[PDB]
Amino acid sequence: NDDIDQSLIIAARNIVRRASVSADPLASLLEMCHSTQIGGTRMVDILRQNPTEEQAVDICKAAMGLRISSSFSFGGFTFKRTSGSSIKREEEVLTGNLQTLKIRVHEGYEEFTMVGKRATAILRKATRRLVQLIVSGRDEQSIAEAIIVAMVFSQEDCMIKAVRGDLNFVNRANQRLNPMHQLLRHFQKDAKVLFQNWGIEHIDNVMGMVGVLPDMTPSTEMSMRGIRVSKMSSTERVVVSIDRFLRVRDQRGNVLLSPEEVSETHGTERLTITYSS
Ligand SMILES: O=C(O)[C@H]1[C@H]2CC[C@H](CC2)[C@@H]1Nc1nc(-c2n[nH]c3ncc(F)cc23)ncc1F
DSSP states (O other): OHHHHHHHHHHHHHHHHHHHTSSSHHHHHHHHHHHOEETTEEHHHHHHHOOOOOHHHHHHHHHTTOOEESOEEETTEEEEEEEEOOEEEEEEEEOTTSOEEEEEEEESOEEEEEEOSSEEEEEEEETTEEEEEEEEESSHHHHHHHHHHHHHHHTOHHHHHTOOSOOOOBOTTOOBOOHHHHHHHHHHHOOHHHHHHHOEEEOOOOSSOBEEOTTSOEESSEEETTEEEOOOOOOOEEOOEEOTTOOEEOTTOOEEEOGGGOOOOOOOOSSOEEOOO
């Protein structure tokens, strides 16, 4: 039933936002999920039996020890590893404003699939290197957003040095964002410099694959390095941890979800959401 899911998501998102601004968001979130009711039934009972995988929903599921999708969310996009592997190595890099950031750099060749509300992509990358990106979204803006995420996700030096400012982004709870999100929010405010310094190259026009330029204009002759455009599976469930501030981590310690990665809501629920604590 799609009506339950639509309302569950709407409820989950509101709960995570309202909990995130608490002193102990995890406690606050557990209180809200126990008493809030969707269409009569208690929410806890829905999470236990509902198959929906969503950022806010999987946060709530994780909060009560339920298995969730191994995939992780970054910049709104759901990354699933199709091939390859990497390992973590806390490096320290230098931005284009001489600000130092301690970043978890991933070493190894990986293949991914990015999925978003308004764009998808296949992303090949390796140690601080974007090999290939085949984005395919709704329109210009939705596709640019997907490329910005890919560039920041790649951890390439040109992207790091493309920073032109001091990164002091905070969240609803007025806490500093972790490095990778600091970079992301900066290049979402304006990706002008990022796209210039990324670099262009000559492309060999193949069907479907169309190139794109730093101004977001196509070309069958030249495109940006590794980035192509186009037009148009199973789920592994795994145990996950959650801490005070609703940061969900897999066993290997990588942040799968956080309040920072939940979308905004439309708030036209088909079922009855009574928010009790
Ligand atoms: O590293 C983390 O703790 C999180 C942070 C928020 C989302 C992202 C990006 C940073 C990351 N989560 C995860 N990242 C990765 C990953 N694999 N290969 C990568 N290359 C660069 C990168 F940058 C992250 C990754 N694999 C599993 C994850 F679960």
